[PDB]
Amino acid sequence: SDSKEVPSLPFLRHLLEELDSHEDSLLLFLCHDAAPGCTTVTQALCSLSQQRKLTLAALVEMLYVLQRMDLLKSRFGLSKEGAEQLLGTSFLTRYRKLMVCVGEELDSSELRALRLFACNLNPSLSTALSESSRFVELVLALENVGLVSPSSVSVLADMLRTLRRLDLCQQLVEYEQQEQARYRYCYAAS
């Protein structure tokens, strides 16, 4: 359409550069529902570009989530005060953005406690989880055994309430409200 919904290709390659190895597998997740299968961040993007989903805004979010105001100004000029002005207009679920925005508050010790935890209520997970895998991954692994999803975060919730991070435990139910709310009360009588 315009220059506010379709990014370039040469600069993407130059953007996908300042983003470390963490922000990559992390970014890939944020879009695992649209580019099913893809690996390299590029892999994912290559498929989004074509599908016509890889919009500029949608992109602005992916960045907005990896929390890089720096890259948000030095490339998009928009500050934190001008990026929140286009969220949701993407293919990024309220959910994905959470798990990420959570796999950030967890540290190496708590994160490895969760690993060795998942590997208990199901020993079929210690075959897709080495204690060097990011949170964002352990989430997807739980997603296959059917332990999480945008509709059943509990298993996880009190998995965190276990690690005593009520905050996350809460912040993961504060979602459980909103989502479990509108998406049933709004798409309700109308």
Residue ranges covered by each domain of the chain: 1-89, 90-190
**Placement of tokens 């379709």 in the chain:** 6
Which ranges of 9-165 does DSSP label H, i.e. alpha helix?
A: 10-18, 22-29, 41-51, 56-65, 69-73, 80-83, 94-102, 108-118, 135-145, 154-160
Q: What does CATH list as the number for 90-190?
A: 1.10.533.10
1-89 and 90-190 agree in CATH topology = yes
Experimentally determined by: X-ray
| Cα–Cα distance for residue pair 176/183, rounded to 1 Å | 11
Two tokens at 128? 């897709």
**Is 52:58 a contact under the CB 8 Å cutoff?**
no
**What's the Cα-to-Cα distance from 70 to each of 17, 51, 86, rounded to whole Å?**
14, 28, 18
Non-local CB neighbours of 118 within 8 Å, separated by 6+ positions: 125, 129, 138, 141, 142, 147, 159
Which ranges of 106-161 does DSSP label H, i.e. alpha helix?
A: 108-118, 135-145, 154-160
CATH architecture of the domain formed by 1-89: Orthogonal Bundle (1.10)
Taking the mean position of all CA atoms in its chain, how far away is CA 38? 15
Q: What is the resolution of this structure in A?
A: 3.8
